[PDB]
Amino acid sequence: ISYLKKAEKTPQTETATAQKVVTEMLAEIQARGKDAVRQYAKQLDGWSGDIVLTPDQIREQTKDVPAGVRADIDFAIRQVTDFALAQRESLKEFSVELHPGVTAGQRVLPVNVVGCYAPAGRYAHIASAYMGVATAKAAGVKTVVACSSPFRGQGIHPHVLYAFQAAGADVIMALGGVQAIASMAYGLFTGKPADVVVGPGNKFVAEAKRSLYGQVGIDVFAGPSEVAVIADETADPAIVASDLVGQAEHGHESPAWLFTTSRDLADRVMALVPELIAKLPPTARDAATAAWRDYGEVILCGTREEVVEISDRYASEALEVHTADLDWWLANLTCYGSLFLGEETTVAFGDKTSGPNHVLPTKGAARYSGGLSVHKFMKTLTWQQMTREATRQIGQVTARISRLEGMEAHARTADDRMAKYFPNASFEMGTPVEV
Template sequence: MGPGNQFVAEAKRILYGRVGIDMIAGPTDSLILADETADAFIVATDLVSQAEHGYNSPVWLVTSSNELAEKVIELVPGLIADLPETNRVNAEAAWRDYAEVIVCSDREVMAATSDEYAPEHLTVQAADLDWWRGRLRCYGSLFLGEETTVSYGDKASGTNHVLPTSGSARYTGGLSVHKYMKIVTWQQATREGAKDVAAATARISRLEGMEAHARAADVRLQKYFPDEKFDLHL
């Protein structure tokens, strides 16, 4: 099951534990990294395109250019005002209540800021796209260059678009076949190979006050190595 809307999120919350879910997704969010080479009108248009998702959909611009930041802030209200009513109301609220424009000293600080936000959608409109692709770590889906846009991913370009929101891209990626795989582990030991493990287990267990755990290790050492002495207490 994908992210859906707030009603789908509530249904997933209720069913979690009875059925498997991918994640409980929050409002969609988008961040644009742009330097002085970016086109302010395209940056502003892309921000508005994601703000129209809903009144609580954050959009963020992180840039190294004061001039670009000021121009985007100037352009956005007019672009929002030109939208149909429902879209306009959503975008106005999202821009007013959740948008941020952050000016950084250089691209390394920009990248670090982006990784801290860990956006669902991350767009780079800046020089040296290979550097950005290699440096950025935390995002749901990455859109490199002015020639692409999150709207392509939303509607037509084909990349998976069930993505982590609310900063969860710090530790997980989008929905994939791996979400439907169950990972299990197993272990088997030889008597000699587990000797050191058993002694360590006994000591750690007693340190934690779990005597029965310790004795499960003790009994094996006593059975397999009756003539040896072990330090089983800290």
């Protein structure tokens, strides 16, 4: 295992800056509520307008959105919705018998209110807007509040707004960043605090969601976008290089990783990536140049197993696999947000319209979670019921363990049932706690 390109910075590098800003802003917002948010909206995003859009404003701001644009977004919404409904079917309710007379089961219930964030800064994240909202509706969530940042010194990008509306948002707000996340968490402006807040964003957005976990549920830590490509000698260096640059344009902090067993592939890609970046237009060129320099990495490995080991350690948001024997890679990789098998599909496809959600774990979160999905909006709750007969065993065990732990009042709830249901039975219910 050898690093042909090592990065100066990682997803961890900017953590402290993000956490500093978020701690300050959240303190302010907790203390000063809506006034703090309007002021942050003013000073950060130059926004003095109304925050909650009326139906009139939405209609007005999207009236001129062309039919061909709407057709593309509607098509994407359908793909996302279809995959979401398939995922919903994968998680089932059930009941079982355990000890005789003990019935237990699992209920699967949607949350009531979701807040969805769609980012807008360098780019306007049209696709993010339907990724959150369409998924929440597919999960059967009753109320969906959606926010996106005022873009390029104006309001919500009209195509983001269209995405939100067509995906089924009930409330739309022109709010960005930390103040958006906090507003949705606390129910500022709407009076409807979210049960779950979802959606991608820069390091401040992702840290704000992470800090507010508890107050709300979340999808996943979904910060500056990442990409890894696993490639063997069959891979096409021109396509690999193209794919790396594709995510590098997200911004200065987006890492692009190449893991390969072919030095010839690595070398060609390392030559091609700067060339591809130089041909980009200004904003993308600016982002990708910094990202590739500071965060880009290339790792040469000797075997497939070493690639797997490295990939799993990196736990990339998105992982492309351009190799032979794709079944082996599906069977063996274990840590990634979203997997793209073979050359034909690619991350940008997943980003816009493949179907599976693009809101995905960054900064190692793929070690413990997949991305936004209907699963993040379903609660899996347990229920149980017993016969009186079942409590003969369950009760005596409960009383004895409870007493071993020191929990006398717990044990008495079992004693009381035994005395009531079976006044003639006599069991070892454990030595009463005296201290």
